[PDB]
Structure formats: structure tokens, C-alpha cells
Write an enzyme that holds these catalytic residues in place. Structure first.
Site, mmCIF file in Angstrom:
data_model
loop_
_atom_site.group_PDB
_atom_site.id
_atom_site.type_symbol
_atom_site.label_atom_id
_atom_site.label_comp_id
_atom_site.label_asym_id
_atom_site.label_seq_id
_atom_site.Cartn_x
_atom_site.Cartn_y
_atom_site.Cartn_z
ATOM 1 N N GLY A 23 0.585 -1.494 0.145
ATOM 2 C CA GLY A 23 -0.556 0.164 0.015
ATOM 3 C C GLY A 23 0.710 1.500 -0.105
ATOM 4 N N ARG A 76 -16.806 -14.425 -7.291
ATOM 5 C CA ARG A 76 -15.867 -12.981 -7.328
ATOM 6 C C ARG A 76 -17.146 -12.264 -6.973
ATOM 7 N NH1 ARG A 76 -11.696 -14.263 -8.635
ATOM 8 N NH2 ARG A 76 -10.395 -16.011 -9.491
ATOM 9 N N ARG A 102 -7.218 -7.107 -7.828
ATOM 10 C CA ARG A 102 -8.443 -8.149 -7.897
ATOM 11 C C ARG A 102 -9.695 -7.372 -8.778
ATOM 12 N NH1 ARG A 102 -10.288 -12.102 -5.492
ATOM 13 N NH2 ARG A 102 -12.210 -12.149 -5.365
ATOM 14 N N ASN A 118 -8.580 3.906 -10.450
ATOM 15 C CA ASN A 118 -6.499 3.546 -9.987
ATOM 16 C C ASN A 118 -5.872 3.636 -10.486
ATOM 17 O OD1 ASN A 118 -5.932 0.454 -10.232
ATOM 18 N ND2 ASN A 118 -5.671 0.433 -12.208
ATOM 19 N N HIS A 120 -2.069 3.209 -12.428
ATOM 20 C CA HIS A 120 -1.430 1.563 -12.857
ATOM 21 C C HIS A 120 -0.468 2.344 -14.121
ATOM 22 C CE1 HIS A 120 -1.160 -0.214 -16.565
ATOM 23 N NE2 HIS A 120 -1.041 -1.472 -16.333
ATOM 24 N N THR A 152 -13.478 1.101 -15.611
ATOM 25 C CA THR A 152 -14.786 0.994 -15.697
ATOM 26 C C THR A 152 -14.826 -0.946 -16.073
ATOM 27 O OG1 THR A 152 -13.412 0.897 -17.675
ATOM 28 C CG2 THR A 152 -15.244 2.776 -17.467
ATOM 29 N N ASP A 156 -8.095 -1.865 -16.819
ATOM 30 C CA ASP A 156 -7.611 -0.738 -17.380
ATOM 31 C C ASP A 156 -7.674 -0.210 -18.847
ATOM 32 O OD1 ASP A 156 -6.012 -1.462 -15.562
ATOM 33 O OD2 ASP A 156 -4.948 -2.613 -16.258
ATOM 34 N N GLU A 185 3.977 8.388 -8.812
ATOM 35 C CA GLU A 185 2.490 7.869 -8.549
ATOM 36 C C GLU A 185 2.135 8.445 -7.572
ATOM 37 O OE1 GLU A 185 1.937 3.882 -8.817
ATOM 38 O OE2 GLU A 185 3.592 3.322 -10.167
#
Lengths: 212, 212
Positions: A23, A76, A102, A118, A120, A152, A156, A185
Site C-alpha cells: 500500500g 467473486r 483483484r 485506479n 496503473h 470501467t 485498465d 504515482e
């Protein structure tokens, strides 16, 4: 000039962060909120792994740190429904994925439409998916970077909010590149969250208009 | 420490540049050679279009400026064979594509194996092909750039030598982005050519090792 005055701050947000390990990005979010750079507070941090260091970062910051075990759910989709439900109990306005390894499913996308972010480690659309740093080195690019995007259904593929590039040095190991990208980031994730909170992000098709 | 002393400079090269129009990149190559930044000289500039401003840049620099008409040849392959032949008459060691809007074919790839460079206005592998700047804006990326790469049979798939990134500003028109990227192109194209001339580029698979 809207929703802000001496007694009211309508754009403040409650952030829910999902993690799976160290994290590193969670730390920047926690600090940003604490130091006043992000207009809001981290309401809760949920990890799909019990021994993730990210949860310790959360506790040290005084934030509720929870562990939800996927193996304790029948499917899931079931796990994602439980996740979404827990997030709602904390009144989360924005879900931020920070190392959460996940895929987000229908239940989460449904509970937080256009409200899941998110980060990436690649300059999307190039190198989507896992191990993007290694993908970059293997392809031979000389420039790489990170991307903050709305999430979405597709891996990615969501609307890009902010991106930051870094050089790829000759002899770079995957970790060397991972570190250099990480430094960016830590900078753009908080900025993206702030822009979201200020109501400056407008999604149009697969693009994002950033207001002044 | 090899091939260089008071009387000998073995790495000097003869550059052949192919253009189709304005030839903005040609200018940087011409200046780089003239001012001593590039170890070599532009031997000839060939345009597939008679009224290309690039040819005027060539004349002003004192370089042979030629126009070869594709319509004067029976086929695409035939044209490429004639191009290759003309380049050889000038003893070209490195072919640099600068705005040349035609695909390189077997004859050229055969005559100059691993000796043809190209500059592309995107951070490959993202957005290969024509109108890469527009492709970037339409996709919604916040960072774009240019790529100098060795040319292979496949459209913009060759080994990457150098890349440079630039921000994409909100409200950027295609021309605005084209200009910002161009400023970087003018910088890395000469650097890539110099590295080639110094024997510092080693192709391994689809990657390029740059020696110290």
C-alpha cells in the site's frame, strides 16, 4: 464559487481505499488528507489480504483498517457485493484502488458508477494489465510512467485523468523502474483525487475534461 | 578509443534523408551536421513530392536535393528499388525518414538492413501509424511524445532508440500537440543519429542496448 463559505464545504469527500499489500500509494493518500492537500478524509482501508502492510499504515493514521477474506465468500461476485456493502457503511464517495490485485465486478461498478479510481504503472493505453513495468522493459521503451484513471468493466480501459512520464535507464531492473514510476504515482494520485473532489473532472466518452 | 586519432575518424557517416513535405526534422539534421553535433554529413535529400519545402532547406544548406516521382515507376517495389539505388550512388550509410509518407519496402530494407531510422510522433507502442497526434487526443491521454526507431518491415514496429514525452494540455488542438512534440523531435533525432554514428546502438531482439 459554489458550495463553499465560512460554514460549508460541500465538495469534501469520504475516500475508501482497497489494497492487497504494501500500500505505497495509500500512504500518499493518507498524508494528503492529513496535511490538507486532499479535500476529504480516508474513511476506511480494506485489504483482501490479512498481512498487508497497508493496513498498518492505516492504523498509524488512525483510519479504520479492515481485512475481508475472499475465501470466506462463495464467489467473486459475492465478494465484490460484500466489499461494496462494507464501503457504503462508511459512506464512501470515492473508491481508490491502491495495489488492489483483484478485478472490480458488477456489484462494485454498480455501487460506485464513475466513482472508482485506479493508478496503473504504465502510460496507458500501452502495457495494460499486470507487471506493466516488466512489460515496458521487455518491449524496450525508453520512456514509461503511470496513469490514474476511472475504472470501467474492462481491464485498465477507463477514462484517463492524469499521467506522468519517467525515463527508462539503460540497465534498469524491474525494481529500479518500479521505484522511479512510484515517485510520480505518489504525486499524481493525490492530485487526481483532489480534482475529483473539486468537481473538476467531466467524463465524455472515454475521455476526461479537466475544468479550470 | 577505437578508430579515432589526429588523422582518422572512422565513425563519420553519410546520411540520406527521405521527405514528403515541410521537412521540419530535416532541418535539425542539417544544422546538427553543420554545427558539429552529428558526426557526419547529409549526403542527399530525396522527396517523393516535387514541391516539398524540405528540398529548399536542403539547397540552402548546400546539400543535393532530389525529387523522385513515384508515378514515373510501374510499382511500389520498383520505386523503392530506384530510391535505394540513388541512395547508394551517394554512398549513404544511414537513411533517415523525415516526414516521408510512404512505406519502406523489401528493396530498401535489403539495401539498408538495420540502417534506416524514423521519427514517429507518439510514445510507441501506443498510437502507431498516421495522425498519431490526433489519435492521442481522441484517446484522451494526458502525456504523449515522439519516438526514434530503427525501421523494420512492420509499420512503426522497429527497435526503439530514443523517446521523449510531453504533456497534453486541456484544449490542445491537434496542431498545438504537433508543435509541442516537434520541439522534442528536433532534439532526439540528432541524438539518435549521433549514437548510431558512434557505434553505441546494439539491437537485441526488438530492443536497443545503448552503450556508454
Amino acid at each position: 464559487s459554489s458550495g463553499e463559505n465560512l460554514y460549508f464545504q460541500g465538495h469534501m469527500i469520504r475516500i475508501g481505499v482497497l489494497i492487497s499489500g504494501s500500500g505505497t500509494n495509500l500512504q500518499a493518500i493518507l498524508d494528503g488528507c492529513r496535511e490538507g492537500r486532499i479535500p476529504g478524509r480516508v474513511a476506511v482501508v480494506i485489504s483482501d489480504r490479512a498481512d498487508a502492510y497497508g493496513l498498518e499504515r492505516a492504523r498509524r493514521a488512525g483510519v479504520d483498517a479492515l481485512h475481508m477474506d475472499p475465501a470466506a465468500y462463495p464467489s467473486r461476485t459475492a465478494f465484490d457485493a460484500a466489499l461494496a456493502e462494507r464501503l457504503q457503511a462508511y459512506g464512501v464517495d470515492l473508491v481508490c484502488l491502491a495495489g488492489y490485485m483483484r478485478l472490480v465486478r458488477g456489484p462494485m461498478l454498480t455501487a460506485f458508477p464513475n466513482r472508482i479510481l485506479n493508478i496503473h504503472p504504465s502510460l496507458l493505453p500501452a502495457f495494460p494489465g499486470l507487471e506493466a513495468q516488466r512489460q515496458a522493459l521487455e518491449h524496450g521503451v525508453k520512456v514509461a510512467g503511470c496513469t490514474v484513471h476511472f475504472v470501467t468493466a474492462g481491464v485498465d480501459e477507463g477514462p484517463i485523468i492524469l499521467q506522468a512520464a519517467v525515463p527508462v535507464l539503460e540497465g534498469d531492473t524491474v525494481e529500479d523502474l518500479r521505484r522511479r514510476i512510484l515517485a510520480e504515482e505518489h504525486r499524481i494520485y493525490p492530485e487526481a483525487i483532489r480534482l475529483f473532489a473539486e468537481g473538476r473532472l467531466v467524463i465524455e466518452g472515454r475521455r476526461v475534461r479537466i475544468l479550470d
